[PDB]
Amino acid sequence: GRATKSIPPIAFPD
């Protein structure tokens, strides 16, 4: 459930 708004937006199922 972790997503970065910083480029690149990487997302983790967390």
Side-chain angles (χ1 to χ4, degrees):
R2 195 183 309 185
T4 54
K5 294 171 180 59
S6 306
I7 304 177
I10 56 180
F12 305 101
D14 167 73

